[PDB]
Structures are given as C-alpha cells and as structure tokens.
Amino acid sequence: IVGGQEAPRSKWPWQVSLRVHGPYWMHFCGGSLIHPQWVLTAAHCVGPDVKDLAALRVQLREQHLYYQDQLLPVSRIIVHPQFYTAQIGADIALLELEEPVKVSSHVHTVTLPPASETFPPGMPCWVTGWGDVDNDERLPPPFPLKQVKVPIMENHICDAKYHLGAYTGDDVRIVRDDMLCAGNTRRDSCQGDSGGPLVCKVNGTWLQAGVVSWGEGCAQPNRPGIYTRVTYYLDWIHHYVPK
C-alpha cells in the first residue's frame, strides 16, 4: 500500500494473508474471507501453473505479520479457467480451507456486491494489505496492515490514461471490461497487496468491488491501479461458494 496509514484493529476483519513455505512462511499475496471456508484472491497469486497445496497456507486478520501466526491449510485452489495473465484478465481465484473458520467481530466475511453495482467515481473505497509502500520499497517491520482511500476512475478514462505515453493504438483496449481502476500518484496498491480487497461502503455495508490485480508500477503518472471487477465474476464465484 502506497500512501495512507496503518489500519485500526477493528477494520477489515475479512483481510487475509497468503503464505508460501520457505525459510519462514512468507507473505506473498492478499485475500478476503467471503465465507467461512472460502478465501477470494487473484489468480496470478496461485497460478496460472499448478502449485503444491502443502506449500500454501492462509493467515486470517492480523494487525502485524508473523507475530501471532496461526496458519491454516488449504484443500482446494480454484483458479478462473480464462486466466493466463493479469493483463488479459480473469485474475480471480478461490481457496477452500480444510476447515471452516469461526466468525467474530475481529474476524468475519466481507459482503459481495449485487451484479448491478457499477462503483462509480466519487464512491469512497479503501484498499488494504501488507504490500510495498512504494516501487521497490518493502513494507518495514513490524509489517502492519495498511489501508488507503483510493478514488475510483471510470474504465474509459483509465484506459485512455494507460494510452498516454504509449505506442499502443488508442482503439486497442488495455483496461478491460472485467477490470476496475482506482488510485492516483499518492494513493495505490503495490506488490504484495495483490489478491486483497478493494471495498466500498454502500448503504452502510462494505462491498468488495475489486481484487488487487496489476498496474504499471505503483502510483506512477497516468497509471492507476487495476483490479479485477467482482461483479463480472459473481456467477463463477457462486458456482463454488454457497449463499
């Protein structure tokens, strides 16, 4: 997370950290709890190639990475079958946990948007995670969960911005219809936040609008952050995750 601030303990109780086995169980991507056995994340965090499940674990909401880890194993990685790269799209995946988690005020699910919600500009939305605090700047220890309020840009503004300073033909779409843009040069996600949630408050409920997907660097001029658009993938999600 670039810009913004350390998150409060009572906020983002759905935030998840994904961990890869090595010298230590290292954070590489975010996720969100959308059901007691289901984490929603980005496909590029776990694919496109098939990983060893035993090398992957999940950590539920933690104010600081590593200090009070209670890792949780994973029984299934479902990755969207359209997925090959983030730039093409369908950068969305699901993790099933070996057990259902227990829900509380500290730790509970996020609500998915109804298919009609467009998330127009001037909606207040926050993105969260333990990723880099700028281009090539690691989040320093003690690795607090960060948040930043990001302005949503309409898809067509954002596509056009990605064409400024580019050779790519204006008619050749870069920001796709299954994607969502937010951020500016002060406020953005970065590496390490991929797979975590962009959430927007609507009628006093938090809805996850996006999954942190990609961008040309972080908080770079004319390069807003790009997120997978959750509305686009509800039917796919619901094929696996009960209502």
Ligand X SMILES: NCc1cccc(C2CCN(C(=O)c3cccc(-c4cccc([B@@-]5(O)Oc6ccc(C(=O)N7CCC(c8cccc(CN)c8)CC7)cc6O5)c4)c3)CC2)c1
> Which residues of this protein are in contact with ligand X, per CB under 6 A?
85, 87, 188-191, 193-194, 212, 214-218, 225
Specify the residue, 13 or 196, whose C-beta has the smaller distance to ligand X.
196
Dihedral sign, Cα of residue 241, residue 35, residue 231, residue 163: negative
The catalytic position among 35, 44, 80, 163 is: 44
Q: Would you call 10 a catalytic residue per the annotation?
A: no
- Residue with the CB atom nearest ligand X in the bound state: 215
Nearer to ligand X, 46 or 97 (CB): 46
Q: Tell the smallest beta-carbon distance from residue 86 to ligand X (Å).
A: 7
Query: Which residue of the set 17, 80, 91, 189 is catalytic?
Result: 91
Closer residue to ligand X, CB minimum distance, 79 or 97? 79
Shortest spacing between CB 186 and ligand X, in angstroms: 12
CB of 191 to ligand X, least distance (A): 5
Among candidate residues 124, 110, 147, 225, the one with its CA nearest the CA of residue 179:
225
- Find the shortest distance in angstroms from Cβ 101 to ligand X: 26
Active site residue 44: yes
- Taking residue 223's Cβ as centre, other Cβ atoms within 10 Å add up to 21
Q: Which of 17, 32, 189, 194 is catalytic?
A: 194
Task: Provide, rounded to whole angstroms, the least separation between the CB of residue 145 and ligand X.
Answer: 16
**CA dihedral in degrees (170, 176, 179, 181; nearest 10)?**
0
Our CB check for ligand X shows the closer of 159 and 193 to be 193
- Shortest spacing between CB 13 and ligand X, in angstroms: 22
Judged by beta carbon, residue 155 or residue 189, the one nearer ligand X is 189
Q: What is the number of other CB atoms lying within 10 angstroms of the CB of residue 235?
A: 8
Verify whether residue 159 is a known catalytic residue.
Answer: no
Residue whose CB is less far from ligand X, 158 or 207:
158
Catalytic residues: 44, 91, 194
